Amino acid sequence: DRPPVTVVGLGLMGQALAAAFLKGGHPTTVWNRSPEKAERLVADGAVLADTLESAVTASPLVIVCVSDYDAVHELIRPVESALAGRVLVNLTTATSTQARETAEWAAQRNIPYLDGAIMAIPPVIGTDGAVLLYSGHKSAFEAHESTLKAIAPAATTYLEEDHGLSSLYDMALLGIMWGILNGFLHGAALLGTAKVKAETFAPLANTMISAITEYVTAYAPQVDEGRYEATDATMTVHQAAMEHLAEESEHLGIHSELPRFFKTLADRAVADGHAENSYAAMIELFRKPTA
Amino acid sequence: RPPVTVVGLGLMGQALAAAFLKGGHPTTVWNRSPEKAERLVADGAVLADTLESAVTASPLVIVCVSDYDAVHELIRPVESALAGRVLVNLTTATSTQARETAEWAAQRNIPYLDGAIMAIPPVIGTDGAVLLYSGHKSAFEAHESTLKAIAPAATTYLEEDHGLSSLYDMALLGIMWGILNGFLHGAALLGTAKVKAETFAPLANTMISAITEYVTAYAPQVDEGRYEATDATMTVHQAAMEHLAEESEHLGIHSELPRFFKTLADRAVADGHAENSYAAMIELFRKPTA
Ligand SMILES: NC(=O)c1ccc[n+]([C@@H]2O[C@H](COP(=O)([O-])OP(=O)(O)OC[C@H]3O[C@@H](n4cnc5c(N)ncnc54)[C@H](OP(=O)(O)O)[C@@H]3O)[C@@H](O)[C@H]2O)c1
Ligand SMILES: NC(=O)c1ccc[n+]([C@@H]2O[C@H](COP(=O)([O-])OP(=O)(O)OC[C@H]3O[C@@H](n4cnc5c(N)ncnc54)[C@H](OP(=O)(O)O)[C@@H]3O)[C@@H](O)[C@H]2O)c1
């Protein structure tokens, strides 16, 4: 006998969340501003609620995954009555501020609130590859751990009592994803000028990525210690190599803004006295506010 | 175990030499600054009195200095002694730089391999080291076995084009900076909540590992020119990018990086990619900065 769960929001991610709960035996009530997106889910045994109220009331565990916290707040305020005493899990993407302003709203209405981040794509939801970071009501998490493991069986991980923490890790991890995707796509656009297929490039990209994890492990203690001994490569060397990517790009008639920018960053680090330091020393520039 | 010469004893130079030494090769080393050979000589390398005596000592000359301007200042005064020896240039280079050095070497009948070291010094000699060579097929085939001392698992020959090693290097370095910036800017973010980078890292690396899946899946999309959004649309990426931008501005940390990222999604969407996967960004990355 698997407990009931409600999923509010049936985007690409919403749909995957619901499906995961359904497959894991939970009686799954779904609702979306656009009901058409429940069609395939209802066929597989989900109940499409007539209203968000009837959706919220159906289950003691409400999962919401919509665009942003403006959409969350438009959705949860009209149903604050029916929410009260139910555990609301907000897996929508958010700033720390947004997560914490929603935490304070929920506490005032005695709604136990977990602020979550989905570190996975929809097809990964339900698999060992999915990592979900939750932070907020410790008791509420402890109570529903087993139900929530339907979307992240290997990595249903609770951080701290701070609701804003899930958001901070999410923001930091997404920045790494775009770092990689931009690096690989800009890299494929480079190799493209030599009629090299991205499918050919990829396995090498991924071998390099795997090896770059070593650098991350090794730069971490350097950031924490504030000591940046260059055992691998100096800012000078990084800086010079960055000139090559910038020039290579300009010259091949491809995108040059990304690498030019990267170079602007090394230039600054070196001007702040980091010439002989490892790439870990870039932490100091990344702490400094912009225009 | 054939003799090998390493010209350049920087952090990378020293590691290259050490690898050859440990692998039994009689290793002659030379550097503009001879002090950097000290530890290598103690382990059995011969410090040549001059670059000429260094080049002459072995039929295989490996050079790893700052840039191709430094290579050309070093190799031109010894073009005589080089002739008929295989010169392997593992210095970082543009495709143009690699190819202008290839044409200089051919005129002086010097067999020329242009290489890229896709590894850090401590990862030279291990299975983790990948080295990409491109140029003289015969010269590579002849010295494969000696060169496997620096990259035993991934001593990889590309094509006869000398500039190709440079293109793969440039593309792979772009990914390194992508990740390092992402992780360091990410640690600066988590830092505002007094979270240690050492704590963040294992999660960073779990996410990175999982992002490799996206790369293998976006590759065929870029090559086929079809960007079906099975994971997430440009719209969704675009919105999420707003969050990092705002979060950063607000926490008093660096905001240029994520703001820029967003500028890219905005453009992709304006070029009609709203409903396409992040693979569609290839089209923006092909377009010059104009
Ligand atoms: N791979 C991924 O896609 C991925 C990864 C992890 C995290 N996330 C996060 O998951 C969330 C949803 O992503 P997704 O793929 O489901 O996005 P999506 O496909 O764009 O879906 C957005 C969902 O939110 C609803 N919504 C949007 N604005 C609304 C409003 N003002 N009021 C009420 N409902 C509103 C939409 O309702 P309609 O159907 O009526 O438009 C839809 O159900 C985002 O915060 C995203 O950052 C996504
Ligand atoms: N180390 C890495 O992590 C790594 C990884 C892959 C590729 N690389 C490539 O390796 C090269 C340098 O690596 P590195 O880290 O060992 O560099 P480095 O520590 O900066 O050493 C640079 C080398 O170049 C020599 N040099 C510089 N200018 C010279 C000149 N005008 N005349 C003669 N020699 C000159 C230096 O000799 P002196 O000591 O006399 O100055 C030194 O041996 C770059 O092309 C870089 O892209 C580095």
Author numbering:
A (entry chain B): 7 to 297
B (entry chain A): 8 to 297
What's the publication's text?
The key step involves a stereoselective one-pot amine oxidase/ene imine reductase cascade to convert N-substituted tetrahydropyridines to stereo-defined 3- and 3,4-substituted piperidines.
In order to gain insight into the mode of substrate binding in the active site, we determined the structure of EneIRED-07 from Micromonospora sp. Crystals were obtained in the P21212 space group and featured six molecules in the asymmetric unit, representing three dimers. The model suggests that the allyl group of (S)-3f is bound within a hydrophobic pocket formed by methionine residues M125, M183, and M214 at the rear of the active site as shown; the para-bromo-phenyl group projects toward the front of the active site bordered by L180, W184, and the NADP+ cofactor. This ligand conformation places the electrophilic carbon approximately 3.6 Å from the NADP+ pyridinium ring C4 atom, from which hydride is transferred.
